């Protein structure tokens, strides 16, 4: 069988998921500026083939 | 099987206690499970043809719906034909009632009239055949379990790029991102609670069937030798103290 | 050979990293709402058995 | 834990259900309920009873051999016996059975015990392998539930509790409960092999009529190799 | 990459360059250009063609078995064979050489094909191992670019697009092309080895002046090893 | 080890330490509770696989692999052919006047000169080689277990610290430092796993391999000494076995 | 230099131009603390397992592999057969009148003409081949260890950066650049592992294979010359060894 990937990559992924949970928390008690979210939304559409 | 009833109970309890916070629609999506399952079948089919995959599926079906013959009922039957041969020779074996295909094949080869070498070769070939069949089914489901999470993350990435193509509202990113992650969740669940468990149960059924088949060929070899059932009792129950059934005894 | 983690673990960490950094980007232009913070904190102390 | 806060801050029916129930489901999909109970029984016996000291077995083998030589082949039924396997050896020797049959019985008992210990090690290493996978699955479920319900704090809370505590439970059960129990069973299996080997060889020497002076020297040939070599120079 | 609505979403020259070119660089550092090109040729042959079915192989071998049984080693020239390995074997048979030298040559050829397929599998497994790693390089580069220019919206889009598409391409190439191609090469290796073992056994059985039907039995013995017998019910 | 190797090790440690210094205060990255959690939990878990005697033996065998270097093979061949020449021009009594370079070779020649058969001496050296090999394997196992469990203990500590942080928020501006302190446990677990325990385990496995080769050479040399064979053949045979 | 290393250099230049264009500038992909962490930790870990002398030997063999192209085997065979003709029609003394570009073959030729017997010549050439193989294997091991440890050190440094960013996190809406700096250490670990150390180890493996093949051809030729075999027979022997010594992927 293939040797697989080292344990540090698993630790890194567990840490990444913990940071997802806590950044979801910070965005949970927050009020996104609607004005500043559509220039970036237009930029992602432009850079993704839609526009 | 009682294990199947426990499986149903665990499925129901897990679903009920997962979907309690909100509605079942957040964790239920036919598109995500279809993506994961279809991609995994396609990937495995590049390394298994349709016939060998349907064979693995049917052996899994046999391993789940049906139950392997117990290696104690087997003892009853073997000593029964041992008594039958001791009272009336091999001519008493055919009229008996047998519900196991392997002993039936063995005795149907025995009645015709054959020495130990040819019947032993045929029986060992059949045992190796069934062992390999179960082994390839375990390989198929190990491949399924290995590729299911990868397909789920590919589906998640596709869903994420589809989500990044559909913006303008702060409130759709959360539900959209959740639907995208649903594919990875399904990939993980199928890997860990279906495909790897199915492969493990296939290996378990392989071990049970291989043990039963060694028991049967040894029983048929002893009957052909014409040995009395006494020493036969010990030389066949001693095989019952290997595997996991010797763990369950106290 | 001693085993390791499956080969998809790198893609999983990749996905975790991408999503985390998408949330830091979303969190970059989001203002905190203190009332929602108090409500989420109360629900948090309720969900951990701390009353 | 106690310095951070209380045990009450790690309690959730959903997280405990996910990790433990999923692990039990996965293990029962490849193991029988009765065999798993037998593995639990053998783990409990390994944890509630220390293995007999090899030195005590060699010395006690010598005392029964002395007693047998003073009072014939039936002189070992008047004083206490420690464990059941040697008791079975004694009650087979008291029957005047030949060497081959008692040897077969002892080798069947050693093999059965070895199989039980290896299978218990396999069950608990399977448990320890599946628990962190269920913790990661619980993190994914909690993340999905959080992202689906970012407008509802009453749902944000429990979802993160599930996500965090599933990982915590998977890690704790895998590395501090299940794998340690499997390691203790492997150690206990090695101890069983050493004690059983010493006792069957002792019974063989008593049956052969060998004088105990050579028997003790022969049994001492076993204790000087094993896992305890990190203490020896 | 179709569930998004079309293909035009899933296309960036930057991500394709970083992923494919990095993987190509790593593989050419691991393998020579000749090995890589040979691996591409063998993968193309395995996918666009099909190895000769063993059933037809046994039928043809017993055909020449009967032909040799009626006319000794001289009839084999006058019938057509569509398979290269059996034709080389029969040529080494008719050119007046002993069993030892032809057996050595066929063993060398089987090992050569096995080693060629094994190296092609290794090349594509290296590709499938490196592709997600390149996806990881691209994710970090795109995420660094995104977090650095948060105040520049026209730079936010492309950086996140490259970061995401690099990962999508790495995952798709690793798990749906390169690892599947390596697995198909392994499947063709096992099938090809079985077919060549059938042919070498047939050639040795034709030299041995022996009945075609027992030859047929030895070859039918080979049809129940591998994934084919799993299909067999 | 060599002074250059120790200087390089100290230089690398110094580089890591300064790079830690330039990213802010170093007391920001220091927490006694986190290091106690990681170290105490790792010791507690490892003690369920190894007794205190086994743990101390592994510590000693790892310590003596950092202050003593495996003898270079050519010196062993040179020395064994030196006592080959000594035996040819003298006798078995000439080896006692030869001073101490390796403990394994010394005990072998001592068991050789006191009057024992070739087979029993071979058996004694075989048990000693096997004993040293298994000692190195158990030490590698101990340190592999430490390196496998240290990230696990770091993750348990980060989750426990984070649960403690979520149990009482009371302040939004205090969330970040609390998560930094909680992640410190993961940082220490990762550092101990990937910079201390796995490197010593890998080094001890490597030292196991060279030591097995070296001890095989010494045993073959002393067995050749008991044969009373030609020393040139010994040199050729040992050099062939090297390659 | 082969095509692979040129492709790597141009790909790295394209990677740098891509990074600078994506990020506008280049100074944010450069962080002294991140480079210091990755390099110092990798050297630290590798020096727990190899000596400083071993590290220099690995570096030197890698430099020699990336600076001097290995001789093509056909040119060596042509050289062995031409000096073989010269010695057949001019004796051993004719071998000091033509130039030699190979130090190992030159050592073998001087050792051959200085009257040493076949036994000592074979022993010395085998010792040289074993020393080169051991040097290459040790270098491959060192660079494999660097590739194994560099991403672990990168993840350690990213943990350091995350602790720094969250510890200094008040009202998180300026944490973007700090998070990027934290990720830079893992980016460095990934680039060093996937694009430098593992490629160097693999090229060292390829050079080990080439040098073993080349050295086996030259030792066989020199020993054939020592016994004075006919140039055509030894020419045939070398051709058979090269075609069988070639892999199956390129035949």
Residue numbers in the entry:
A (entry chain F), C (entry chain G): 11 to 61
B (entry chain A): 3 to 252
D (entry chain E), E (entry chain B): 20 to 252
F (entry chain D): 1 to 243
G (entry chain C): 1 to 251
Show passages lifted from the paper:
The high-resolution PomAB structure was determined in a detergent micelle environment, raising the possibility that detergent molecules could have an impact on the conformation of PomAB, particularly the membrane-facing helices, including the disordered TM1 from two PomA subunits. To clarify this and to better mimic the native environment of the stator unit, we reconstituted VaPomAB into membrane scaffold protein 1D1 (MSP1D1) nanodiscs, as well as full length, non-cleaved VaPomAB into saposin nanodiscs, with E. coli polar lipids, and determined the map resolution, at 3.9 Å and 6.3 Å, respectively. In both cases, we were able to trace all the secondary structure elements of the PomAB complex, except the two PomA TM1 helices. Comparison of the PomAB LMNG structure to the MSP1D1 lipid-reconstituted structure did not reveal major conformational differences (root-mean-square deviation of 0.642 Å, 1,312 Cα atoms aligned) that could arise from detergent artifacts. This indicates that the flexibility of those two TM1 helices in the inactive stator unit is probably intrinsic, which might be functionally important during stator unit activation.
Vibrio spp. are highly motile bacteria responsible for various human diseases, the polar flagella of which are exclusively driven by sodium-dependent stator units (PomAB). The flagellar stator unit uses the transmembrane ion motive force (IMF) to generate mechanical torque to rotate the flagellum, which is employed by many bacteria to direct their locomotion in liquid environment or on viscous surfaces to a favorable niche. PomAB assembles the characteristic bell shape of the stator unit family, with conserved 5:2 subunit stoichiometry and overall architecture. Five PomA molecules arrange pseudo-symmetrically around two PomB, with each PomA subunit comprising four transmembrane helices (TM1-TM4) folded into two radial layers.
